From a paper:
MLL3 (also called KMT2C) and MLL4 (alias KMT2D and ALR) are two closely related members of the SET1/MLL family of histone H3K4 methyltransferases, and often act as tumor suppressors. In this study, we set out to clarify the histone binding nature of the PHD6 domain in MLL3/4, and find that an extended PHD domain including the PHD6 domain and the preceding zinc finger (ePHD6) in MLL3/4 specifically recognizes an H4H18-containing fragment of histone H4.
The crystal structure of the MLL3 ePHD6 domain revealed that it contains a canonical PHD domain preceded by a zinc knuckle composed of two antiparallel β strands and an α helix. In addition, a domain swapping between these two ePHD6 molecules also contributed to the dimer formation, in which a zinc ion (Zn1) was chelated by three cysteine residues from one molecule and one histidine residue from the other molecule. The dimer involved only the preceding zinc fingers, but not the PHD domain itself. In the complex structure, the histone H4 peptide bound to one molecule of the two ePHD6 molecules and was induced to form a β strand antiparalleling with β3 of ePHD6. Of note, the β3 of ePHD6 was also induced to become longer than that in the apo molecule. The residues 14GAKRHR19 of the histone H4 peptide could be traced reliably. The H4G14, H4K16, and H4H18 residues formed main chain hydrogen bonds with the main chains of Q1102, I1100, E1097, and D1098 of MLL3, respectively, allowing the β-sheet formation between the H4 peptide and ePHD6 of MLL3. The side chain of H4A15 was accommodated in a shallow hydrophobic pocket, formed by L1101, V1123, and A1127 of MLL3, while its main chain was restricted by W1109 of MLL3. The aliphatic chain of H4K16 stacked with the aromatic ring structure of W1109 and interacted with the hydrophobic side chain of I1100.
Numbering used by the authors:
A (entry chain E), N (entry chain E), O (entry chain E), P (entry chain E), Q (entry chain E), R (entry chain E): 1514 to 1519
B (entry chain A), E (entry chain A), G (entry chain A), I (entry chain A), K (entry chain A), M (entry chain A): 1054 to 1137
C (entry chain B), D (entry chain B), F (entry chain B), H (entry chain B), J (entry chain B), L (entry chain B): 1054 to 1138
Write the structure that this text describes.
């Protein structure tokens, strides 16, 4: 539901 | 390659043509650019996914300014400002 | 096996897990069942796809009964009743 | 061949692509089919043109049934139900 | 000459008389002046087209301040503030 | 010839062009035809004039059926349904 | 004299008594004072006419600050803030 | 002759001109005729007075049919349907 | 004495008891205090009357700041902010 | 004589004058008569009390017909239709 | 003792148990604390009573800043911001 | 004895007092009785759980009549009518 | 251990799995983080419970800035801004 | 419709 | 309808 | 549709 | 209805 | 869908 873009 | 979460396959991860050959679905488009501010994501942008419209977006574009805030709302169920 | 329009891959055709392990995205769910009446499609069913929510749905669940009406709304772009304020 | 009121040209009469390759502008689409009921016009049909959205539509799809009523709404300027808040 | 996207002809590109002999359709009018700010476009003005009302308008008049923003919303489907 | 209440002149009685060459002002149009039902008046018709939009209209198109009701709404000032939020 | 656009006659241009002997119609009243700010027009005031309510009003009282803006919206069809 | 509750005077009983020469105030007009249905009162009519707009009106035009219901709404203060948002 | 505009009589101009023996009608109350700001009028206060609710009120409490503005809106028909 | 739940006193049981000499508070008025239908209660009547406006009212005037339904809404706290936006 | 205006008795003035044994009615609660700001009243606080919800509240919490304002609105009929 | 999904404990199965001594939380109350119709459930009843208010309720009280419809709304996540604006 | 107010048992106080094995009910989630600001509570945070949605939240996130305010609204019946 | 209070 | 708290 | 007042 | 978090 | 005016 939540991440850092990579 | 990557896995596609839509079909479960190992995938080239081509541009989405769900809407038409030239047009992504808004969920697929939302992986690369924010549906609030319309900026391409930068590496390390904190993003979260609305359970309603299925789109990713910047935490900061929903007034969520910390990992702590993002984890709390994502955990209980995130309903973005657009869908409210 | 199935063509995934989202990524281009050919797949065994697995449940969408875009939202999470327990939840298809609404567009993927709308392939198999109408997001208005929550019924599985018939082979015979006229369906069309909203440009605003990316969902398929029964023509009849939007008060469009004929290929004539469906054809006519695609000429301009279909905005479904659930997306219209 | 057809007169284009938009640019003044005489044309072979090709699909409007003002919106894009797949999409007529709503005014051009409204020449051939009603934007309220999504049905192709009859020769017999009373139609009128909204001053706010530039679309043609069935008089009957706006609850105007007669040349009397159509004539009367043109005297003041027609604002269609879809443009009225 | 130009091509007219409405009829597909090579065209003089005369003033639109769709509404009446003296009155353009709002889409044709929107090619020369912004329907938000009512200013004539200046050469190099960044403009985009709403998929609803079929009008062009200034990106800046929709709080889209870069080519990047304009490309992202135009790609996925632009619904202007007037039509929302 | 006709008395113009707007300017005081006697006139041959020409189409109002206050809005433009193609358009009567709504008050002038409302002299000849009802702005609710878009029908030309009968000699027999009870009509009244809204204090907010200056338009004449059928009493019946505002659910006023009698001289009693019309007389009663003029005592206080008529605000028509189209002007009421 | 003047022409009256309502009746087409050459006219003294008397006060309108459309509403009652003492009361103008709002369109006639709007020729002499602005229906937004309720100021008498001053000579050279830029004014335009709403196609809905048939009233004249100050351009500046509708956030139209130039002849260019006034010509553009009047040309395509002016719907004033009161009628929207 | 009539008692004026507004000023305390006894009067010949002249048309209210509080609004202007042509217009009664709504409270004075509501003495003779219902501001909901625009009909003159009967001797038999149950009427009550709104605390928010000061108007009299038919009990029945507010869906109050009995002295029981009227008595009950006066115990708490009557806010009429036209004053309620 | 004064004339009462309600009954037309020469009058002592007693407190209104229209609502009850202790309670004025809002129109009569509005002759002595403003229904917007709830201040007693001061001698020379510019006031005007709404054609809807029949109340007097301060011009300044309706953003009418001059005799010119007050005359213009009162002439054509004044609908106060409370009734709009 | 009557128990006053508001102050704890035993009283001869006098008209509430909390609002003023002429006006009961809405909660006190709601003891004797329904604030929805404005009818005096029956011995047989199912009534319940809103947690938001403190008023008693007919179960039936809120579409609750049985002790089962009344019991069930008290388990969670009753918000009446007049308090719900 | 005091008189209770609800029952007319001479009274100890116990906590209201109208809603339940632990819960006042909002009118009784409003005698001791403001339903707008939720502050206990201080001795000499100017308060007035809404004719709709039957609650007392601070004049200042309804933008009534003087005895003059409070007397004028209380006299004609006070409808608080919560009930409007 | 009963499994509490809220805390993981096995319990004798006591009235929820999460809100207070007199009040179950709405989710706990919704186990025994429908928050739409305020009726106790049948063994036979199709029920589903809203993702927005955490309440159980009759499928039929949301116009879902079949396991087909219930299954279909769980694929995407159920937002009940009381949570939808 | 603790008591669980939902079931009345002495309890390990495990994560709520009311919504699904991975998802708390919003009431249980609201014991550890504020549903307004999405911050984990800090020791000594003043919190109160809405009688509608059954959630705890920061007093300051409802513009209740003192124990006095919190006690007054909690006593009479607290309806949070989300539920109003 | 408009006066000064006196 | 109006008082000072005492 | 647009003029200067004179 | 009201507490400090501990 | 997007251009510079020329
Ligand atoms: Zn999917
Ligand atoms: Zn795929
Ligand atoms: Zn963003
Ligand atoms: Zn969303
Ligand atoms: Zn896609
Ligand atoms: Zn369907
Ligand atoms: Zn849609
Ligand atoms: Zn055109
Ligand atoms: Zn049609
Ligand atoms: Zn239109
Ligand atoms: Zn076209
Ligand atoms: Zn052309
Ligand atoms: Zn612009
Ligand atoms: Zn648009
Ligand atoms: Zn006139
Ligand atoms: Zn008519
Ligand atoms: Zn009108
Ligand atoms: Zn005219
Ligand atoms: Zn004339
Ligand atoms: Zn002006
Ligand atoms: Zn206008
Ligand atoms: Zn009076
Ligand atoms: Zn009546
Ligand atoms: Zn009223
Ligand atoms: Zn009067
Ligand atoms: Zn009098
Ligand atoms: Zn004032
Ligand atoms: Zn008014
Ligand atoms: Zn009490
Ligand atoms: Zn009842
Ligand atoms: Zn209630
Ligand atoms: Zn009482
Ligand atoms: Zn008592
Ligand atoms: Zn206060
Ligand atoms: Zn109140
Ligand atoms: Zn839980
Ligand atoms: Zn049910
Ligand atoms: Zn729900
Ligand atoms: Zn519980
Ligand atoms: Zn438990
Ligand atoms: Zn917080
Ligand atoms: Zn709440």
């Amino acid at each position: 539901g939540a991440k850092r873009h990579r | 390659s990557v896995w596609c979460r839509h079909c479960g396959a190992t995938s080239a991860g081509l541009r989405c043509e769900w809407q038409n050959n030239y047009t992504q679905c808004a969920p697929c488009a939302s992986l690369s650019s924010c549906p609030v501010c319309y900026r391409n994501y930068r590496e390390e942008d904190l993003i979260l996914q609305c359970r309603q419209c299925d789109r990713w977006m910047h935490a900061v574009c929903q007034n969520l300014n910390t990992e702590e805030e993002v984890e709390n709302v994502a955990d209980i169920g995130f309903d973005c400002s657009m869908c409210r």
